[PDB]
Input
Amino acid sequence: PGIVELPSLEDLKVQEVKVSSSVLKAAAHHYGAQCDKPNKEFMLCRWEEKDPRRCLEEGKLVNQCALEFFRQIKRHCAEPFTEYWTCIDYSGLQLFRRCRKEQAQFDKCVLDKLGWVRPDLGELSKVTKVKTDRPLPENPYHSRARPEPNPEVEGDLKPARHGSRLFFWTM
Amino acid sequence: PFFDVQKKLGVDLDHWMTIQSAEQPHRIPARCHAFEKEWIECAHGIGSIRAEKECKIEFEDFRECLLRQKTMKRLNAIKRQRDKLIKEGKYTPPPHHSGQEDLRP
Amino acid sequence: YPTKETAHWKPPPWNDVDPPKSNLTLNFGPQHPAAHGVLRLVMELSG
Amino acid sequence: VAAFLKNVWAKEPVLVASFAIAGLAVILPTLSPYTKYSLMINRATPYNYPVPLRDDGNMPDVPSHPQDPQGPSLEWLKRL
Amino acid sequence: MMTYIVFILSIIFVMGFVGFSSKPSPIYGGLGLIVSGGVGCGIVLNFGGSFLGLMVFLIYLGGMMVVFGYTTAMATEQYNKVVLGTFITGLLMEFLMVYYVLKDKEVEIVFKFNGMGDWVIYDTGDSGFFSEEAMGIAALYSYGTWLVIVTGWSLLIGVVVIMEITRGN
Amino acid sequence: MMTGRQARAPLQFLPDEARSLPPPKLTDPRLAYIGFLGYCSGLIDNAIRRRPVLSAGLHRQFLYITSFVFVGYYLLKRQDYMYAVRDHDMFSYIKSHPEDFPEKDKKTYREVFEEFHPVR
Amino acid sequence: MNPIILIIILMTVMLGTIIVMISTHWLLIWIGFEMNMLAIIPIMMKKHNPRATEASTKYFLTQSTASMLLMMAIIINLMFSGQWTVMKLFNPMASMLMTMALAMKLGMAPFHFWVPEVTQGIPLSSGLILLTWQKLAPMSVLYQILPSINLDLILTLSILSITIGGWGGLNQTQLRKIMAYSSIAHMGWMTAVLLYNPTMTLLNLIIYIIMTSTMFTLFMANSTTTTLSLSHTWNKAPIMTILVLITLLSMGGLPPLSGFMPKWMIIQEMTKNDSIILPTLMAITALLNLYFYMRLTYSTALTMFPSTNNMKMKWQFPTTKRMTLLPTMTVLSTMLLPLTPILSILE
Amino acid sequence: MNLMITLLTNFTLATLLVTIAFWLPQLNVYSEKTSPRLPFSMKFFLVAITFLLFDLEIALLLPLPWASQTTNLNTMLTMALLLIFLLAVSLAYEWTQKGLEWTE
Amino acid sequence: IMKDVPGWKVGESVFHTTRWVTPMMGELYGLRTGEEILSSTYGFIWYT
Amino acid sequence: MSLVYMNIMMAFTVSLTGLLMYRSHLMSSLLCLEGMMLSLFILATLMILNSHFTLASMMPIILLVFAACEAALGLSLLVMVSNTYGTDYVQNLNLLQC
Ligand SMILES: CCCCCCCCCCCCCCCCCC(=O)OC[C@H](COP(=O)([O-])OC[C@H](O)COP(=O)([O-])OC[C@H](COC(=O)CCCCCCCCCCCCCCCCC)OC(=O)CCCCCCCCCCCCCCCCC)OC(=O)CCCCCCCCCCCCCCCCC
Ligand SMILES: CCCCCCCCCCCCCCCCCC(=O)OC[C@H](COP(=O)(O)OCCN)OC(=O)CCCCCCCCCCCCCCCCC
Ligand SMILES: CCCCCCCCCCCCCCCCCC(=O)OC[C@H](COP(=O)(O)OCCN)OC(=O)CCCCCCCCCCCCCCCCC
Output
């Protein structure tokens, strides 16, 4: 069959978010509050194209808006955030419930110096609508033409011509 | 004597476990969901006789998704040629195929 | 049709019932011989 | 029925406690006002990803941001 | 070697089946089926069937083979050529199959078989905050309603049937 | 053979298009033969229990006759329905495929040469 | 047995058969066969003698082996198709194993070696259930998997079943073994026409169940398990000799009887597909079935064997048995050939 | 992996204890000592089969703590109470037909 | 690697479709070392 | 196909040919039957976990439950045979030759 088409290694170069999972999980609610639009453009493009090769520019926009988010944390509230993700980072399950005072300090400093509001319980699982400029994928499964169906039955049902026609049975 | 009582009464006794492309708990996709969906939506309504000779490509893609025989045969060819070139000394493995390049994310 | 192989075959019983074709005996003693220790019991147990 | 109940509670109280606990387990969730909230909490637990919708132009109930007013809410769960 | 762990456990599995299926005695046959059930459980566990492997240990080895050894103890007496000969026959057939599918990375007895480690065929993604195997088993109560009805009816009928045929009257 | 026809609508003994067909008359010789089978079942039922064969249980003989006629009427309706379905599918398949059913150029016996084999 | 428990266990037998007949999933097919065997085991052990325990053990071993081969065929189908719909099988190995498993469940030759032993070991009512109702579910699965059934396999099983069920009944004097070898020959007749027209398969199965139900009901009503005990029936109830005469003449395939209907329709649908040698050899082989049927008619109805003195006491008592549907089944097994185009209701 | 290491270590310590307990009392040479079917019960087999069938019913009951998380709770609760009820009905039929007798 | 091999299409799909197929474990970690293979393919199962 | 499927199917056939060739004991026959079930369990489980076919995760449990109830039925048959003949030998089950 055909040759698979892959992007070059230059097209896969982006400035990664080289932080740990507790750094992300500590920042995850404000990240979902603030980096909404490129993330949902990317996930809409990702569930519609069904191909990670058509989604690389939205992936780079996600990977860029996340860096802008952490730079904007780093300019104002580096120390409460650092204490908070260290407390998140101690726990083996990384519990939010063990870390409520450091979360309170980080949310206080984030609401004061950046105006960011933490999402309530129920908001980051809402289904949101995304305004895109890319076209809707018209055949994302790359399905070929379906076979034409068998003909339907039509007409009125007449009696059997001379009955059963089983050897001599005249009905 | 397939007495299709389920389609007669409208009950769903076992149509849910019948295929991989059905409704799954927590919307978990099967690893060959698209291939099975393509083969079923091809072969739907045209019968077995037309489905074996008109939907052959979709069923071959789906069987090769399931069993991965051509994929494993292709990897066997590449790996055997690689090991022959390593034994002959005419090929070197790159550092990113030896654990020396500080992986992506 | 009688043969040499099917020669010893008799017909089955008329009610299709065949003949059936015991109980345990225990030589018993007290577990720790502190109290009694000098008892012998020949049981006939039925399970 | 009061003589039989006291008699079976005198003779076989383990079976009376068995049938009483089993009968409460059967008829009690249809009488409880919190059986609704079990369904409400299980359908509100977000296992999958909330795959967003293409904004065609007419979806007034769907929010554009998670912190928008419209959309499904869990204030009943915070409060109870 | 360590990438072939499921394969090596499957070789131990076939060796255990050649062990008990050559039938030395129902006691040692039970022992061979116990060791075989344990290593086949390990085969299932190394794909991510942790609940299904614990179902092997808890149900298969835990109840059923215990009842087999129990009933054997009531029907055999406590105190050959054909068993050991059939044992080494099955062992040589299995090792010749191993040798072919290892030196060739390919064999065909009834179907074509790969010779690489079966690590190759796995998925490269996650399941999130659940096990897919656990959620599919949990759906026996919400999706498998008819399946639960016929399974419970067969088990109740099975209790009735065992009390009928062991009654003797 | 016709199992894909009655698979869109399963377990219908008489479909709605069976009503376009004329029902069997109640003086159908097939249905009268089934009534004769009911009378014979009544006679065998009086004979195996050593009742008088023609006299005993006239209510029972009449219920035998009635029950066989009642079942056989719907059996004849389904029989005529399935043969009508068979002819309907035959004619629609011939109509949809004219290349597989060419209208045969019929020659008369003045052009047809048949080899004569004498009996002598 | 408790009559409540008897009714529940027979409903569970029927339930397993219905679950095989209605379900669209292979696991539920296997579940139906498991439930069917699990429920029919007490019916075979109804009288609790060592022949019934031996018969139930042999039946258990054969049906268990067939159920495990059925599940292996289902598992190879799940490999090579990724799904579970009860339809054609997507691998010839799964098709071979499932055809073997259903051949073991039907007791077709060369997997026939349990049917006369198990039928002899059990009573006449349980033998009736085994030889009529237990044929329904595997023929339904064969009816559904026929786009994948290998032709040479099913016709080998068919002609081997017809030949071995012909030669097996010629040596028999026990009635249950005669009915079992009759079963093997008629299952060969059913599966021979399966890939050609399965409506005629269902016609053969229905006429066979009617005639076998008639013969087992006559054998129950006369309480005769051997040829020579059936020979005393003329001095006890002479109408029963007439009924077993016409039913044995029907099962031999003689016109104008309705046992000629299935084999005539099978020959009729096998000559359409340009097979001439095979229905001719099948028809000539069925003359052996007719031979031991005529042996039984000679011993029962056409001659008068010697009776004993104690039959005079049994003259003074009527049959108080529920001869359920015996006149209906006797009429349907003999006088149905004028209604031969009724077979279209099974289309 | 760590599980396999732990199983091998427990098996090794157990085999070492068994090998010591068989070979360490063979050090002291002792005076070599020169002087000098079972009955079936139906109830013993029946309690084992009753165990096996109720254990299969338990095998059906084991996915319940995962099954409560479903969105089809009314069907789930119905089938859960139905499996426990069929286990209780198996126990009641085992009771009333003299099955739990002399090993009650 | 596959230069000396005659008739070899590099990057040839084993599927007739042009749809993106999710890669297999052997397609990604096929040419890499056995330690990375084990850590990617049995790591979560063997984790503690 | 995959390499482990060869060994699991060969395990099924080994327990098959064990079950199809009796030595003396009916218990060893039932052991071979449940070894067939064990190999079927493992093979179905490896397919269903490999495919990520979620709903068929309950299939091997239903297989295990039905076939262990079947095994209980077979053990009760063996127990009745052993109470008849004293042993569980398959050469004692030969009354139905005539
Ligand atoms: C205003 C509203 C009301 C208006 C009312 C208008 C009518 C007024 C009269 C009402 C009564 C009508 C009765 C039925 C009409 C006549 C049917 C007829 O004769 O068909 C000729 C039919 C074909 O001849 P056709 O010259 O082409 O047609 C003349 C008509 O146009 C025939 O017309 P078709 O072309 O429409 O015929 C249709 C087709 C024409 O037939 C065919 O296409 C050929 C296939 C026929 C069956 C071949 C089966 C071969 C294997 C079985 C051999 C059986 C051997 C004989 C019996 C042995 C002992 C049981 O027949 C069938 O498919 C039915 C099957 C045969 C049953 C015939 C009716 C019997 C009713 C009474 C039964 C009593 C027992 C009789 C013996 C049982 C056996 C018949 O010939 C035969 O079937 C030969 C046998 C004779 C039939 C029975 C004669 C009826 C009267 C019997 C009274 C005497 C009973 C004696 C005591 C009991 C026996 C011991
Ligand atoms: C409706 C909800 C769901 C119900 C089903 C679920 C039940 C869960 C519990 C499982 C129980 C399993 C075993 C049941 C066996 C019942 C039969 C029984 O035990 O009968 C025998 C007993 C007498 O005991 P005996 O045989 O003598 O014991 C030897 C020592 N003497 O006989 C007796 O003691 C009499 C037993 C019958 C009467 C019991 C009445 C209890 C009433 C409690 C309050 C009402 C609860 C609602 C249920 C309706 C009860 C009528
Ligand atoms: C595509 C097909 C779909 C399905 C179509 C329908 C298939 C029907 C298959 C019928 C199979 C019948 C098997 C036998 C009945 C089962 C229950 C039973 O065993 O009843 C007999 C009963 C038991 O009583 P018991 O006391 O235990 O017996 C010892 C004698 N004292 O009582 C006795 O022993 C008394 C003696 C008389 C028993 C006569 C029973 C006749 C039942 C069958 C009637 C004919 C079948 C229906 C018509 C044809 C349908 C195709």
